[PDB]
Assembly symmetry: C3
Homo-oligomer: 155 residues x 3
């Protein structure tokens, strides 16, 4: 068994919606990023790659490479997962923590779990997503962006 | 074995003391929250619920429900633990990291461990709590609030 | 198997270079701290100590004790590791996440892995280090300091 941890942040910019955990969530502002800016899946990806000792998302899918512009972070998740499985690992379970003042993530979590469980080829019970605000404190509390943390356990 | 991760933040407000890890710690200011605002136990709770794929603290004990006003976060911890055990899990070990410029947490950690070990029904050796400041940087460094992170391993 | 988590922050100050994961990295500014201020190894140390239920870095190597001034964080890592092994644990794997806007950590990661794997007496495959920026948001985004998170799995 191997443990992994990921952390990611994206700033708000433009018109909504935002894509979090693969779900299109309505919001006043959108998120700025090379890909679709899915903070949750990026953090999740780093956790899995980390547990596999494969590095991180930027190393495998460079900000510079134009092939990843507007990229579906789920596509990146699946590829990172493919490579991980090739190194010989299987999923243990993953846990994600979205840190945002708004929008409300709770109603979208079930669908996020559905998408992630599909992408990782596992049972929905092997996937957990949660959210918390920083009580108006910080860049997240001031609504400047969304952060996300994740841990993974590979077998 | 399942892994879990939690993160929580509460802003200072009012007169002290603050309750962290169940311990009443003397401080100039107190913490604002629906319950007693125990940042450490909330983060710990999310870690355990996450590892159990039970969601998060807000989902089980809503900010809206007046039954949780002034609530003892230890009561919430035990209940979340009860439910977790019902899903069939046993405690592996937990690790907590309190992020605060002040007050000093170190002298209160032993008692925190005592409380948590009791609430989780485990040996004190299965529980670890630590602290760090962000070196005056950030909302924590500016003394605007306390943050806390936690990881858990269920069996 | 036991899980651990660590988090650390150090503010920029003075002339460079900075020491991260044991590597001397060229930078305009340096990092302020009692020891060499290696944010990555401190976070890693707390993760390992946490998983071992040995507390944290400050508890074992006090900011007050002048013996640790300018200290090589690798020396502190090895000692914490020595004690951990004495409690009976062996390394599972560790994962580190450096949170910095700059400098670029990627090219220095291989050497960091070499140092850490040596200090922990393991294969480089049992060690992973990654980096991410907070997209100009926060004290890290504003270049005020570097943060770092880490998780560890002991056996
Ligand atoms: N300080 C930093 C920040 C990011 N990066 C590299 O850039 C990639 C991701 O960049 P972002 O911060 O834009 O998400 C990561 O692979 C990371 O290693 C780095 O090498 N040093
Ligand atoms: N962006 C956010 C922030 C919090 N929440 C929900 O609110 C509950 C906790 O709220 P607090 O941020 O007040 O601790 C969590 O269960 C979380 O899922 C959310 O759904 N979306
Ligand atoms: N709020 C805080 C912050 C740090 N500390 C103690 O100080 C030591 C490390 O201090 P630094 O924040 O300077 O890294 C840790 O062992 C921690 O327990 C504390 O006891 N309470
Ligand atoms: C996902 C990738 C794709 O280029 O980039 P972004 O969408 O900018 O977001 P980031 O988290 O900054 O970096 C990692 C990259 O792999
Ligand atoms: C603990 C609960 C209880 O209503 O609320 P709070 O004391 O406000 O703190 P929070 O961490 O914001 O949310 C989760 C809730 O379950
Ligand atoms: C590493 C030690 C050594 O005195 O201190 P620092 O170099 O200041 O950094 P910190 O992360 O604040 O605290 C823990 C101490 O053990
Ligand atoms: Zn990202
Ligand atoms: Zn809380
Ligand atoms: Zn430090």
């Amino acid at each position: 068994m191997r443990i992994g941890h990921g952390f990611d942040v994206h700033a708000f910019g433009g018109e909504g919606p935002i894509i979090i955990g693969g779900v299109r969530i309505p919001y006043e502002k959108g998120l700025l990023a090379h890909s679709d800016g899915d903070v949750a899946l990026h953090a999740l990806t780093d956790a899995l790659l980390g547990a596999a000792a494969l590095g991180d998302i930027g190393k495998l899918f460079p900000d510079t490479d134009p092939a990843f512009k507007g990229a579906d972070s789920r596509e990146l998740l699946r590829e990172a997962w493919r490579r991980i499985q090739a190194k010989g690992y299987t999923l243990g379970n993953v846990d994600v923590t979205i840190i945002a003042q708004a929008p409300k993530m709770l109603p979208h979590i079930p669908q996020m779990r559905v998408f992630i469980a599909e992408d990782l080829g596992c049972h929905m019970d092997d996937v957990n997503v949660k959210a918390t605000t920083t009580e108006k404190l910080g860049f997240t509390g001031r609504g400047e962006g969304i952060a996300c943390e994740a841990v993974a356990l590979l077998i």
